[PDB]
Amino acid sequence: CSDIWALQGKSTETNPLYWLRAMDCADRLMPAQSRQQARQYDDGSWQNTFKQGILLADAKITPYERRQLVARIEALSTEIPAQVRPLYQLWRDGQALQLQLAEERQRYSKLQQSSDSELDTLRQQHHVLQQQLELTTRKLENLTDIERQLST
Amino acid sequence: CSDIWALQGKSTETNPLYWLRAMDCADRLMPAQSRQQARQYDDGSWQNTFKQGILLADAKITPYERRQLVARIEALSTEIPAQVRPLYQLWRDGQALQLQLAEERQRYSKLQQSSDSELDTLRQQHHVLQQQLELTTRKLENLTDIERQLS
Structure with a gap:
């Protein structure tokens, strides 16, 4: 399961059972191991690229790094390869859904942000107005009571 | 790509290639044709439950149905079977994530509702007070003017 990463050749590349074992082995690795193992596959081939993606997927990576x-x-x-496409597709879909999940998380907190600064601003103005109204009301009452008493 | 759902046996059910094909053959059916197939595998065995899952997954179901x-x-x-586990996990995770995206979609609509509700209520309460201050100021400016006339 450590020797699975080093396998190359067309009979491996085109082999869905290989990639499935890779995905399996990837899930047994701690984030730091995943990153270290992934560094060894820099050649820029699709095989290495795919391996990198499999290893780093659960390596506690940012929504940006994932994208x-x-x-x-x-x-x-x-x-x-045509044999792998269905497996690849299933994996790719999972990654796409995690990015959508990242967006929706960001989009929510943005709404929570702006709506809270709106509420805090409005309730601030409301308190200021509550205080302004009390003072003016009390003044009016006070003067009115004096003027009522004076005229009688 | 048909009768793939019918194929059963130890040899078949421990072959990730079978299930991987079933997933490829599920993505080629209309919700009606999927539901018809899905109805044939309801005995509650893991083979059947898994076939049902694969068939309904993308048969235009609702978040409730999926949950x-x-x-x-x-x-x-x-x-x-151990051979199949990593393929199952991958497929399960996809469904779990779709459910999570549905819950968050509803969460976002829940906050967009209650945020607008709070800001509408307070904006109204604020409007009522602004008017109240406008009326009080005038009544005050009346008494001010009357006493500052000497006529």
Whole structure:
């Protein structure tokens, strides 16, 4: 399961059972191991690119880094063997859904942000107005009471 | 790409290539044709539950429908052959993520509602007060003017 990463050749590249074992092995690795193992596959081939994507997927990577990975492998979508495509597609879909999840997380916090600064601003003005109204009202009452008493 | 759903046996059910094909053959059916196939595999065995999952997954189902489909397959994870486990996990995770995206979509609409609700209520309460201050100021400016006439 450590020797699986070093396998190359057409009989491996085109082999869905190989990639499935890779994905399996990837999931047994701690984030730091994943990153270290991934550094060894820099050659820029689709095989290495795909391996990098598999290893780094659960390596506690930023939504930005993930978007970078997905982009690199999607650019070599034509290079993925016909036997592998269905497996690749399933994996790629998972990554796409995690990026959509990242967006929706960001989009939510943005709404939580702007709507809270709006509320805090308005409730600030409302308190200021509550105070302004009390003072003016009390003045009016006070003068009115004096003027009522004076005229009688 | 047909009768693939019919194929059963130990040889078949431990071949990730079979299930990987089933997933490829599920993505070629209309929701009606999927539901018809899905109805034929309802005995509650892991083979059947998994086939059902694969068939309904992309058969234009609702988040509610999925939140059920998800709970079923996650339960029979222990009966899945080791060879097939990584393929199942990958497929399960896809469904779980779709459910998570649905919950967040609803979460975003829940906050967009209650944020607009709070800001509408307070904006109205603020409007009522601004008017109240406008009326008070005038009544005050009346008494001011009257006493500052000497006529």
